[PDB]
Write a structure and sequence with these properties.
heterodimer, A: alpha+beta, 4 domains, 5-stranded mixed beta sheet, 13 strands, B: 527 residues, 12 helices, binds the ligand Cc1ccnc2c1NC(=O)c1cccnc1N2C1CC1, DNA-binding
Amino acid sequence: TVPVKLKPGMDGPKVKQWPLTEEKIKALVEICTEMEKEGKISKIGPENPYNTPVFAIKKKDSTKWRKLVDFRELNKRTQDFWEVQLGIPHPAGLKKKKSVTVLDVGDAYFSVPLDEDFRKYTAFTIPSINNETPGIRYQYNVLPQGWKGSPAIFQSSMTKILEPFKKQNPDIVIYQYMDDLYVGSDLEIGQHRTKIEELRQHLLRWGLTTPYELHPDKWTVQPIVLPEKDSWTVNDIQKLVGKLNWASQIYPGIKVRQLSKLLRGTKALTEVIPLTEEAELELAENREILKEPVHGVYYDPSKDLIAEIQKQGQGQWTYQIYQEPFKNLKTGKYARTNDVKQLTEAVQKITTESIVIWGKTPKFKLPIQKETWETWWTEYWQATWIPEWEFVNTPPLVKLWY
Amino acid sequence: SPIETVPVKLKPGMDGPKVKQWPLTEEKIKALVEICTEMEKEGKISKIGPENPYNTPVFACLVDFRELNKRTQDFWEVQLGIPHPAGLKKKKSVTVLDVGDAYFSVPLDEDFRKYTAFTIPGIRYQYNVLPQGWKGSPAIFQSSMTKILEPFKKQNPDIVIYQYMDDLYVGSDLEIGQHRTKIEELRQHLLRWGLTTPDKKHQKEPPFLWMGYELHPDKWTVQPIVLPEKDSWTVNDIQKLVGKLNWASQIYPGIKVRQLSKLLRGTKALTEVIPLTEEAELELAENREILKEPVHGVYYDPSKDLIAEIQKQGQGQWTYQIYQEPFKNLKTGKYARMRGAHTNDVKQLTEAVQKITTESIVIWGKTPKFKLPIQKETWETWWTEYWQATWIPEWEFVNTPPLVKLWYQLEKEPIVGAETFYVDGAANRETKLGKAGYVTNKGRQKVVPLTNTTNQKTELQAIYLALQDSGLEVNIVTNSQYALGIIQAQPDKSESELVNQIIEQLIKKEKVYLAWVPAHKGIGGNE
DNA sequence: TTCCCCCCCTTCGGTGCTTTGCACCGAAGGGGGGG
Ligand SMILES: Cc1ccnc2c1NC(=O)c1cccnc1N2C1CC1
């Protein structure tokens, strides 16, 4: 086994367990009873003080429930075992391939055992309805699915499994993030699907049980546009000066001196204003200036990306990924049932794109109540990873994105 | 007694008790030795020589294990929550058992017995069982009894057994004569492991007093609340009354505490008197009238659906009941927390709905179907327009007033012919004096001097001046994001009476449009 | 002169704009039922 060192001078995972539905508890009981026979998990006693939350989910077009353990505190504590010991350099060409396919290789982690000294740190509890009985506890005997150290130990086996394939097909790009594998290529759909199927078989003959296409050319950051009115009015003109005034901070080549020159004395908001030609020039030039990309915005590894989502209404959400404010690395819209479901899918899509582009999930700022999210986010989730989310307290008053 | 022990450790850089000689009065010293000799007979405590450098202070009324409790490793929490009677399934027969010397009938870890050194002034001994008063003892006892009880349930699954510390409630649907033979089987099984459960003639009879509930086999109720009688109440008296009313609300419908919760504000002294106003005393009398008669809950039937009515008592206080059959509440409760300075009734409905959602997930394992006093189109408009995300699981309208409705609404585009105002407010930050006023497009103008109001307050009440000096169709232009954010949320209650007056003005107007313009750009009338 | 497990309300401290006043939120006090 590979010994695992915690970051020096820190405690362990002591996290409470969220209450769960009857269906998601029957699923957990059945899954863990089946996992204990294989020896993957081991029942534990009172001498173990640690805990991490556990939920159950379903995959795309799947009926079988899947156990899912939240390992975020453990990752924050064991990132010494990764940053020092394995920092995987993110491929740069992954952003451009015509199609990237995402595959689940988490089951391949069940083969390799876990360090015996570390096991006590991965304890978890299946609770009971109404606290009628003490929840049954367990511990991992093999490498878990969710930890950031689990793929780092298995790097050698996946390289050995994938090398007889990387030799034959050097064009495709294979990247690994947590339990998930991204394979990117420029082939057409028909050849790409068969290529991915035969690749799955190369792993299967190597003894991997491995069971989905995002088009990266479509993933391009969106431009900003000034509003266009053939007929201008006092309310419409005042709105533009504010929108441009907000825009000045993010793009500092935008000017509103002549545009505000018309508005000098009280006038009914509804009244039409003939627009002066000199001001029309500033409007004409400004729309083009908005298209021109900002300069100085280059990804920096030292900091962590932060993602904002703003509900624009009628199924439309707009998100921005920024290392620091007024400098956006990406910017986009998501259009789509429900409203917590829409935010869940938006979060998943944003972080999948962020993993493809920069190789790390952002810190999300969610426009939802903390308690409603913590109740319902696990009902429409379908990803083995989980980002770090905060919640916002005040309306987006600017809201000048859509 | 033949039970596998739990291997205990200690924290790094720690040791056992180093307590020095403990003084004791002679009559206690000689008298207690007989218990120590007695316990040592069955082997609960064993004499040890000088190999132990640990000693523990002696108390008589009992061992001061605080030194070990502080220096011992952390353990898993024994009780992360207790059942709620509403979720208990209905049993035909229920029985209570109490295992004697339970903390003494489970052995202690061999390597840990050494640290439990106790000396009588003097000869020493060490505990061979789970020492009472220890930090980790309840968890170890719980684990041991779980292991002991599992096989019996494995043969017989038609019974259900619950372990509250030492107590063992056993329930079944078997006939009384056939239930007694099952309880005798359980008694024999616990005898096989050496546990002193009582005989048939000493077992308790229903109801059972557990955690403040009287539990019957086919119903449940709350421990009788004796309402304090104080013509001159105090801080402590009001606190106790509020606590007992909050506790008692879970089965007595419609209990108010907010009027009495108000009186507990800003009282540093514990004893200083707080007279009950007319409202507080009236509410207290009504609560006494409610508690006059006794009401009982019923037991969850997992073959029927869950309904959760929600009513509004007014003033931001909500009551709810949960039942399966009509007029048979499984549970009741109230939601009354105020969140934020400004909010309205729809948002508070949302918070109440999600509260009941979480509680019903915890207690019953599934979400109920709400019967809400809100119109479908009202909720639809609110969630489509609001800037957050929210989703009420499942609900239907109930035509039981008072209903929920947003008392007003703004306009999206400026109105033609509507009178247009250009407001502003300023205040001197050093002296807390300022001005507020507007310049209407038609020509009307007005300015007000102001004291004891900050910049935000004056910018907020410039809107009040504009609304006062307007008609019905008004187009206000504001140069303040703070006031805009306050007004734009459609608040219908607040902790500021200025905003209360603003809301009262805004409900009167037929159509109000308000817009925002930047500061320092010299836009139109603003400059 | 214990450990605290939940239920509720008020008071108060830190954070982040809505910026040196004000907006939410979690962490200290009490009560209630506990053993
Ligand atoms: C305190 C407690 C906790 C959980 N369940 C029960 C009890 N005690 C009862 O007396 C009881 C009463 C009614 C139904 N179930 C009960 N039982 C169940 C076990 C038969």
